[PDB]
C-alpha cells in the first residue's frame, strides 16, 4: 500500500511496529503490523479497530487507517516521538512537580473520556503512555481494552503487565470497574516519583506480597468483600510503609492524590473525575505546559 516502512520501532506480543511516511501526507505513522492461522484476522487487531474508531480525544491515540490482505492486517497511528517509560528510565531527565502534574493530568483526562464511554484500557503502564513532540500524552495499545458496565458479562484477569496490576485483578476478580485503570495510574505516579517500578513482583503472589508490604495488608474495613474474590488467600499483616516515608519529596496534596489511587476498595478508589477535582491539580505550581515537558535527546 501507499506507505514506505522507514524504521522498526519495536515488537508487541501481537504485532511489530514501524515508522512509515504515508506518500499522500506529512503524517509519519506507526504502522502496527500484526503477526500470525485459520482463526481469521487477529482478535487483537479487531479489538483496537472496534474501540478506537469510536473514541476521539487528544489524550487517546488516533487510529488513522487500517489495511491488509487475507487474514493479515495493519493498524496505522500517528507516530509519537517518545513514551513515558523512556522518560522515567532516562537518568539525565529531572521530573519536577509541575512535570509530574502535567503527565498525571493528561493521563486522567484521557482516562476520564475513556471511562465516560464505558471502556477500560486494562493495560496501563508507562510504555503504553505515548508522548508526542508537542508534549501531549495519549493512551495507546488498545489491544486489551474492553467495555464494562455489562452485568451478565464475565471478564478475564491477567490484564495489566503484572507490576501495574490491581489487587482485585491479582485476586482474579471476574467483574471489575474503572479501579483497574486507577490502580495502574497510582503505579505510574509512584514510578514518576521514584524513577523505578513501584512494585516489581515476578509472580502474581510476589505482586500481592510487594503491594501488601508497601501499602499494608487490607483489612475488611478497607475492603468489605475482598474475601469473596475467587483467589483470595489471606496474608501476614504487613505494616505498610506510610506514604510520606515512601515519597518523602511529596506534599500533602500529592499524598492525597496518591493515597486515593491506592485504596484497596476498588469502589472507594478515586475515579478519574474525582481525581481531577482534587486540590493537587488546582494547587500551585501549575502543570508544565506540554511544550516545556522534557524531551530525551537520546
Amino acid at each position: 500500500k501507499r506507505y514506505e516502512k522507514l524504521d522498526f520501532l519495536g515488537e508487541g506480543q501481537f504485532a511489530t511496529v514501524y515508522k512509515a511516511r504515508d506518500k499522500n501526507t506529512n503524517q509519519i505513522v506507526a504502522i502496527k503490523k500484526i503477526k500470525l492461522a485459520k482463526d481469521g484476522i487477529n482478535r487483537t487487531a479487531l479489538r483496537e479497530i472496534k474501540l478506537l474508531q469510536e473514541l476521539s480525544h487528544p489524550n487517546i491515540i488516533g487510529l488513522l487507517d487500517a489495511f491488509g490482505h487475507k487474514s493479515n492486517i495493519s493498524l496505522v497511528f500517528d507516530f509519537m516521538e517518545t513514551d513515558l517509560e523512556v522518560i522515567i528510565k532516562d537518568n539525565s531527565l529531572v521530573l519536577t512537580p509541575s512535570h509530574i502534574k502535567a503527565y498525571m493530568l493528561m493521563t486522567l483526562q484521557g482516562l476520564e473520556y475513556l471511562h465516560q464511554h464505558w471502556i477500560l484500557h486494562r493495560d496501563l503502564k508507562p510504555n503504553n503512555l505515548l508522548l508526542d513532540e508537542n508534549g501531549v500524552l495519549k493512551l495507546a495499545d488498545f489491544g486489551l481494552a474492553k467495555s464494562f458496565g455489562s452485568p451478565n458479562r464475565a471478564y478475564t484477569h491477567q490484564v495489566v503487565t503484572r507490576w501495574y496490576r490491581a489487587p482485585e485483578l491479582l485476586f482474579g476478580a471476574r467483574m471489575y470497574g474503572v479501579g483497574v485503570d486507577m490502580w495502574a495510574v497510582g503505579c505510574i505516579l509512584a514510578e514518576l516519583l521514584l524513577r523505578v517500578p513501584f512494585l516489581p513482583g515476578d509472580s502474581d503472589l510476589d505482586q500481592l506480597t510487594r503491594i501488601f508490604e508497601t501499602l499494608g495488608t487490607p483489612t475488611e474495613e478497607q475492603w468489605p468483600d475482598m474475601c469473596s474474590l475467587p483467589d483470595y488467600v489471606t496474608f501476614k499483616s504487613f505494616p505498610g510503609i506510610p506514604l510520606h516515608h515512601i515519597f518523602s519529596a511529596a506534599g500533602d496534596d500529592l499524598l492525597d492524590l496518591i493515597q486515593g489511587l491506592f485504596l484497596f476498595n476498588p469502589c472507594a478508589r478515586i475515579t478519574a473525575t474525582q481525581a481531577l477535582k482534587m486540590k493537587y491539580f488546582s494547587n500551585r505550581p501549575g502543570p508544565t505546559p506540554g511544550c516545556q515537558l522534557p524531551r530525551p535527546n537520546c
Binding site: 452485568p151 467483574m175 468483600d225 476498588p266 491539580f281 488546582s282 494547587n283
Partner: protein
Amino acid sequence: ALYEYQPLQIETYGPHVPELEMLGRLGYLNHVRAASPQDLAGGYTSSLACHRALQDAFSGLFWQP
C-alpha cells in the same frame, strides 16, 4: 498557569440522565439486579449497569440525521 477543572460537555441528544450516586435515591436501582459480593469486591456495582442502561435509553433520542 493553574489548571482548573471543567467537566466533559458531551451532547447526548436526549433526556437528562440522573447522576450515578443519585440513582439509589431517585429509586432506579430497585429495577436492576443487585451486584453480588464478588462483583462489588472487584468494583462492579449495580449502579454501573443501571447508569449505562439509562444512558443507552436516552442517547440520541431527540436526534434526526
